[PDB]
Amino acid sequence: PLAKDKVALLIGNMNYREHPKLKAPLVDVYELTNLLRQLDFKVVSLLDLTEYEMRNAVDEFLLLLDKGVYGLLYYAGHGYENFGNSFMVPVDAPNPYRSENCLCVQNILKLMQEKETGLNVFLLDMCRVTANIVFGYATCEAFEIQHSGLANGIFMKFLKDRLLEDKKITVLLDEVAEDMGKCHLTKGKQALEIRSSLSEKRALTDPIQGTEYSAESLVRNLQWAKAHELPESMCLKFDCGVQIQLGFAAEFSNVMIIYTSIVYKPPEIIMCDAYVTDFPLDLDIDPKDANKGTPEETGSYLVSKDLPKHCLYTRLSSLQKLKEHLVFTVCLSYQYSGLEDTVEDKQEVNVGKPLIAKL
Ligand SMILES: CCc1cccc(CC)c1NS(=O)(=O)c1ccc(-c2cc(C(=O)O)co2)cc1C
Numbered sequence: 001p002l003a004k005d006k007v008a009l010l011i012g013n014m015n016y017r018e019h020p021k022l023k024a025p026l027v028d029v030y031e032l033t034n035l036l037r038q039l040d041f042k043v044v045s046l047l048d049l050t051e052y053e054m055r056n057a058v059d060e061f062l063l064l065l066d067k068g069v070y071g072l073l074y075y076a077g078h079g080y081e082n083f084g085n086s087f088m089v090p091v092d093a094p095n096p097y098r099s100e101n102c103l104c105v106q107n108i109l110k111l112m113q114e115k116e117t118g119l120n121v122f123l124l125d126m127c128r129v130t131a132n133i134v135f136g137y138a139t140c141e142a143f144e145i146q147h148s149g150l151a152n153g154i155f156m157k158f159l160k161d162r163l164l165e166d167k168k169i170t171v172l173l174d175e176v177a178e179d180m181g182k183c184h185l186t187k188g189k190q191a192l193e194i195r196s197s198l199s200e201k202r203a204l205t206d207p208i209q210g211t212e213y214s215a216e217s218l219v220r221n222l223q224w225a226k227a228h229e230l231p232e233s234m235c236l237k238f239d240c241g242v243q244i245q246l247g248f249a250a251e252f253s254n255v256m257i258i259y260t261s262i263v264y265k266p267p268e269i270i271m272c273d274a275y276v277t278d279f280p281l282d283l284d285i286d287p288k289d290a291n292k293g294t295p296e297e298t299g300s301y302l303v304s305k306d307l308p309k310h311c312l313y314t315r316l317s318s319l320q321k322l323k324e325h326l327v328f329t330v331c332l333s334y335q336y337s338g339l340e341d342t343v344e345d346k347q348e349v350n351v352g353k354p355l356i357a358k359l
Pocket residue numbers: 007008009042043044046049052053054056057058060061220221223224227253320356359
């Protein structure tokens with residue numbers, strides 16, 4: 001069995017405006033992204049999407065599902081069930097739940113049934129002609145804290161240990177269901193429901209068609225690369241002599257970490273700090289969560305010890321809301337040894353449209 005292409009969309013909703021916040025989707029989406037990339041999937045990973053953002057991302061993923069393509073859609077977050085229908089709850093959903101503000105799972109499944117995909121795996125990890133659809137519906141908020149301090153969901157804990165196996169995906173999911181049935185938290189409970197219309201031996205490990213005769217995979221690699229460009233590191237020189245470096249890192253397709261570091265501080269300056277401020281209003285960055293001494297303090301625990309020491313960190317987690325160039329100010333507060341007060345100096349910076357903001 002061959003795949004025309006391998007495309008995946010992973011959505012993790014945590015920071016809910018009107019519902020309890022979740023912790024596991026952060027690590028789960030991150031770890032599943034790296035695992036799927038190892039299996040040659042072009043992965044788009046998105047955190048904290050609103051109703052209109054979720055609908056657009058799912059529609060765009062559905063658009064990639066041409067004949068023979070392998071697709072994987074994973075959603076982790078709040079879910080709701082109402083009279084035979086299940087719904088994915090976006091972060092801007094009002095309380096109480098209502099269908100028009102949520103994404104109907106049955107409507108997605110119905111649109112997936114119309115595709116001629118080689119394999120379509122739709123996995124929900126919710127806090128409650130064949131299309132070859134394999135649907136996994138986990139209803140575990142329960143999670144486990146690792147030796148690292150990161151929260152791993154019950155479904156993903158077992159899934160990550162078996163996802164790289166060269167076995168038929170339905171057989172793989174049935175092993176994960178057995179693992180959860182042995183787990184004390186989910187032992188005698190209906191924690192995972194698998195529905196499958198898979199008539200042939202398809203696996204996530206199946207190779208992609210050769211590029212000599214099938215160039216669809218190359219186009220999608222170019223489009224994935226285009227939507228995943230990080231700004232290059234930049235050095236700003238200030239009038240007092242201080243030089244600041246602005247660094248960039250990616251956590252998810254819509255989550256970027258910005259850090260500032262002091263490259264040079266003249267001897268005359270006793271203490272200086274470079275802060276990033278005045279970001280575009282659509283980004284919704286609360287200044288009390290920016291310019292932290294560690295990446296963890298910003299909510300960034302993946303790509304945390306992989307950033308230089310003695311920097312200030314800022315997490316931009318809503319890049320899908322950016323409709324213009326990312327223009328912000330680098331503020332430098334500095335003190336001379338024998339001076340009365342702190343001196344302020346501001347410099348504007350344009351880093352274009354990073355990651356999915358490019359689209
Ligand atoms: C081929 C690479 C790929 C693999 C898997 C899945 C996709 C589509 C999701 C894509 N295409 S992409 O060009 O990288 C892409 C990435 C993100 C978004 C998006 C829209 C919103 C929003 O409207 O809020 C947020 O993100 C839209 C696209 C077209």
